[PDB]
UniProtKB/Swiss-Prot annotation:
Class of the enzyme per the UniProt entry, highest EC level: transferase
Functional description taken from the UniProt entry: Catalyzes the amidotransfer (transamidation) of the octanoyl moiety from octanoyl-GcvH to the lipoyl domain of the E2 subunit of lipoate-dependent enzymes.
Organism: Halalkalibacterium halodurans (strain ATCC BAA-125 / DSM 18197 / FERM 7344 / JCM 9153 / C-125) (Bacillus halodurans)
Key words of the record: Acyltransferase, Transferase
Keyword Transferase: yes
Catalytic activity: N(6)-octanoyl-L-lysyl-[glycine-cleavage complex H protein] + L-lysyl-[lipoyl-carrier protein] = N(6)-octanoyl-L-lysyl-[lipoyl-carrier protein] + L-lysyl-[glycine-cleavage complex H protein]
InterPro entries: aa-tRNA-synth_II/BPL/LPL (IPR045864), BPL_LPL_catalytic (IPR004143), LipL (IPR024897), Octanoyltrans_LipM/LipL (IPR050664)
Active-site residue list: 134 (acyl-thioester intermediate)
Name this polypeptide is given: Octanoyl-[GcvH]:protein N-octanoyltransferase
Annotated BPL/LPL catalytic domain residues: 33-235
Family named by the database record: Belongs to the octanoyltransferase LipL family.
Residues the record marks as site: Lowers pKa of active site Cys: 146
Domain of life: Bacteria
Membrane-spanning ranges: none
């Protein structure tokens, strides 16, 4: 019996940092067998989450200024991946399950991949999209254009497979903002890592790829139906008292490490 956590309908004050605290709390409680596997859906207003490496770029302050120029708040995720965009047209799903023998890193990525393909039941590839921001081995795309990115977080015996799904709007416009971020952050200077060379055309939202408009709720519904059609008993619940304690503690740590990195 899976638990479902709906964090998709809150105001623009609901921060990505809080979201990070939630996934960490879930990994901790599910890792102690005190909580059932959890599906957590979340959405945030205009936010650019930078990776640790992005924050150390030569002209970072100019990069952040540009991003604040796009009316996007900026934070850095400690376990650095690379700059990714978060807005009302981006649905994020976190599948948090118990870490066990035989359930590899790739097993986690594969599970999320299968889940997406089923929600949209042969066109979807799991392949790094060169030219896209936050490129990874498990980028998801159709006709060669990236519409989702996957990452995995493992702490306290819990595994959180996370994905950002570009549901509505233009995938390319989001990329142009990030390209501008790197342009001003790198500024033609040497860097400590191979930053992505953004090619806007290699990214697209599901609405653009499927040829018809979809909103976050439509895609959320698909995931819910797909899970139950596959045997899961989804129950809409809130955190337990102990989880709230872990949440506050996790959020305090996360919130301080972000303020620093900036």
């Amino acid at each position: 019996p899976w638990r479902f956590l709906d964090h998709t309908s809150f105001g623009p004050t609901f921060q990505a940092l809080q979201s990070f605290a939630y996934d960490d709390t879930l990994c901790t409680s599910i890792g102690k067998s005190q909580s059932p596997p959890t599906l957590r859906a979340w959405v945030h207003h205009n936010t650019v989450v930078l990776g640790i490496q992005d924050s150390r770029l030569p002209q970072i302050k100019a990069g952040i200024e540009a991003l604040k120029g796009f009316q996007h708040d900026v934070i850095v995720r400690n376990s650095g991946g690379l700059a990714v965009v978060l807005d009302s047209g981006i649905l994020n799903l976190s599948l948090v399950l118990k870490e066990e023998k035989g359930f590899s890193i790739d097993d986690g990525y594969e599970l999320m991949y299968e889940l997406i393909c089923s929600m949209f039941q042969e066109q979807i590839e799991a392949r790094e999209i060169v030219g896209s921001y936050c490129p990874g081995s498990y980028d998801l795309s159709i006709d060669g254009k990236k519409f989702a990115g996957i990452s995995q977080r493992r702490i306290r015996g819990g595994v959180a497979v996370q994905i950002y799904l570009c549901v509505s709007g233009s995938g390319a416009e989001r990329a142009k903002m990030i390209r501008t971020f790197y342009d001003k952050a790198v500024a033609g200077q040497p860097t400590k890592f191979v930053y992505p060379r953004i090619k806007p055309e290699t990214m697209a939202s599901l609405s653009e790829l499927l040829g018809q408009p979809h909103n976050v709720s439509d895609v959320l519904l698909k995931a819910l139906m797909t899970l139950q059609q596959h045997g899961a008993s989804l129950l809409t619940e809130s955190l337990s008292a102990d989880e709230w304690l872990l949440y506050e503690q996790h959020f305090a740590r996360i919130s301080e490490r972000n303020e620093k990195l900036l």
